[PDB]
Amino acid sequence: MHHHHHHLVPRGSPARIGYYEIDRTIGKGNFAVVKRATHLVTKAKVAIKIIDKTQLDEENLKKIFREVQIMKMLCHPHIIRLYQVMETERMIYLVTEYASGGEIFDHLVAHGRMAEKEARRKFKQIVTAVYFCHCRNIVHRDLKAENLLLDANLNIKIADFGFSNLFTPGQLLKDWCGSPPYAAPELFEGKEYDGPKVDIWSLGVVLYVLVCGALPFDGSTLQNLRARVLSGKFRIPFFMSTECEHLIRHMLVLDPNKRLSMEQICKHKWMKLGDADPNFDRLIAECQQPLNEDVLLAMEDMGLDKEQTLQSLRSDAYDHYSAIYSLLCDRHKRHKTL
Amino acid sequence: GSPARIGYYEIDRTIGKGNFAVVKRATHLVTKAKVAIKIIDKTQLDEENLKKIFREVQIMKMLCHPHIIRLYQVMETERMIYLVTEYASGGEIFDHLVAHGRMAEKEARRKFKQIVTAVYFCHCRNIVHRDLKAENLLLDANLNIKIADFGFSNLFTPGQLLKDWCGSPPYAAPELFEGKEYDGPKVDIWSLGVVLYVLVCGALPFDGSTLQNLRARVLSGKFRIPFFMSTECEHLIRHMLVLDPNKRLSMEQICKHKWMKLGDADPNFDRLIAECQQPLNEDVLLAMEDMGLDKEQTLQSLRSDAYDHYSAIYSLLCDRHKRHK
Ligand SMILES: CCNC(=O)c1c(OC)cc(-n2cnc3cc(-c4cnn(CCO)c4)ccc32)cc1OC
Ligand SMILES: CCNC(=O)c1c(OC)cc(-n2cnc3cc(-c4cnn(CCO)c4)ccc32)cc1OC
């Protein structure tokens, strides 16, 4: 049955940004669009956050540089990984790791709520990510289901540090952050707040979503949701363990100081349940604190300058050279060719 | 829109791909029913495309018909839009045509009769599908037609003209290629002409390596007619696939056409056709009353016409009462 497959509006040719080939929009931002793209050289898949600075005042531009420097600080298996930054007279391109699984919340809609054994595994991965950030003086401030992503193995990757900010222990912050349902009651009231304690509440709403498949606080209008957040009251389904209810009930506490610290959340009885986890305690210990020559030889064969490659890596400028090393390195762990 | 809920469906396998959507087979957890879900990524939609699906969703609400796919529930999340519709076990007609070849005119008529009743039903309701292709023709377990993908469907008032391009190019009437303004029902009819040719011949009436080649082919209005085709069928098609839109048959003339009337007499066909010119089922409500869910809120869901988890379980159970469960 001979036939051709024609495209109604003849679709134009794909855009390319210097070895990247843009596929589809995968995110929308305040001043950005996120597009999935392919690195033509390494065949790897990546996300690219694309920012049009023409429409930006000078303030917005500094906030974006702050975000970029924060991202440079975080190389963590459960934090989205920044591969390279490109800038032109007019555009800023952020090339970050691509998460095949997508939003966790949509994934739950498809497959239902998490059995606590599962929820414990992922939450452990999330906390190692957030603890790593807090230990390095950063707060996400927008920890929501939508910013929690899954790779092909369904491991967490936190993403979109646009609302993230640097902080010193005990500073107060004045600007609002994040999605309202994951917002701690102080943000609604508008008080100044300590950064990590507001993430803890957001991490509380996250845990509830994982085990129950529901939101603790929700409303038809912002005022209604606002009422529900301030009440500090929520449903607990019968299937939840008492240790989990203890954990969540003590994370989602209206008094910011009455909230647990990140250190005892890792020690909480619910976390210790199940088979003992050495790898978890290791990543938590690491938070307080070489020359893959195979890839190096491969890049030289492709004609990339051996000396310049080393200079890009040591200088830590995320450029055309460092990104190909990082990408070929991630491919080399997968045991694929070079 | 309306908020999505975790643990009401279990999505399993891809069954279609669309411009900005994927359709996946899923099972309704409460009723164990099988359903199809079109999943749309809102990040991929500009403001115009967002309104387009809202129009599609509004149009699906208007149609409750045995040969039109039924929309059960609409769900939305931050990034995704969910359309939960009736699942057609037989699948695409296109798939069936690939697997088994052209259809004998006897069966082609059985299917085609079912198709026009749906298309005529839509037209009677001031709706035009505009994308009628073998890929949007589905079969249920009884091998009955179900029309699908009202992505291009649009409302109209008789004698209004429409301006935007629509649908698959092989099934496009020559005026859409030319870019002229057009009467909606007349383009549905050409598109149905191509469908009939596809069913009876297992071939495309118009095709080309490039869109320009194909376009030239449609504009010529000339096509092959096989020797194995009945003289009556050729007449029908030749009068459907007419370059001058006004010169094409009306849907009334299509239903009364000599090819349609061939074979054994059809009371059920003419009945459905008549129905197009111009039922609360309390039995399930007690079954739902048995699930302990609030009768007052369910009735408000049905009157309010908001397609939620209440509407889905009602519509699904209602299908069980037709199934004789
Ligand atoms: C607007 C600001 N956004 C960011 O910073 C940001 C971000 O947060 C909004 C997320 C990503 N991001 C990385 N991989 C992704 C994969 C999906 C996805 C969706 N469906 N699917 C299934 C297809 O297989 C996959 C979606 C987003 C992804 C990148 C970002 O820019 C660095
Ligand atoms: C993106 C636009 N698509 C739509 O509107 C759209 C659509 O487009 C034509 C079709 C369906 N649809 C409903 N039931 C189906 C069953 C099969 C199927 C395939 N194999 N099998 C078993 C035999 O192999 C069954 C395939 C598609 C089905 C749903 C849709 O979303 C409403």
Author numbering:
A (entry chain A): 47 to 335, 344 to 392
B (entry chain B): 58 to 335, 344 to 390
Which statements did the authors publish about this structure?
The salt-inducible kinase (SIK) family comprises three isoforms (SIK1, SIK2, and SIK3) that belong to the AMP-activated protein kinase (AMPK) family of serine/threonine protein kinases. SIKs have been implicated in the regulation of several physiological processes, including circadian rhythms, bone formation, skin pigmentation, metabolism, and modulation of inflammatory cytokine production. The SIKs control gene regulation and act as a molecular switch, and inhibition has been shown to reprogram myeloid cell types to an immunoregulatory phenotype. Inhibition of SIKs in stimulated innate immune cells and mouse models has been associated with a dual mechanism of action consisting of a reduction of pro-inflammatory cytokines and an increase of immunoregulatory cytokine production, suggesting a therapeutic potential for inflammatory diseases.
The crystal structure of SIK3 (60-394 T221D) in a complex with 22 was determined to 3.1 Å. The structure contains a classical bilobed kinase catalytic domain with a flexible hinge region connecting the two lobes and forming a hydrophobic cleft serving as the binding site for ATP where compound 22 is bound. In the crystal structure, the kinase domain of SIK3 adopts an active-like conformation (DFG-in, αC-helix-in). The kinase catalytic domain is connected by a linker to an α-helical ubiquitin-associated (UBA) domain. The UBA domain packs onto the N-terminal lobe of the catalytic domain, forming an extensive interface consisting of 536 Å2 in buried surface area, distal to the catalytic cleft where 22 is located. Compound 22 binds in the ATP site with the protein adopting an active-like conformation (DFG-in, αC-helix-in) and as such can be classed as a type 1 kinase inhibitor. The benzimidazole nitrogen of 22 establishes a hydrogen bond interaction with the backbone NH of Ala145 at the hinge. The phenyl ring is out of plane relative to the benzimidazole scaffold, and the side chains of Val80 and Ala205 provide lipophilic contacts to the substituted phenyl group. The amide group forms a hydrogen bond contact with Lys95 but not with Asp206. The pyrazole ring is coplanar with the benzimidazole scaffold, allowing a displaced π–π interaction with Tyr144 and a weak hydrogen bond between the slightly polarized C–H group of the pyrazole and the carbonyl moiety of Ala145.
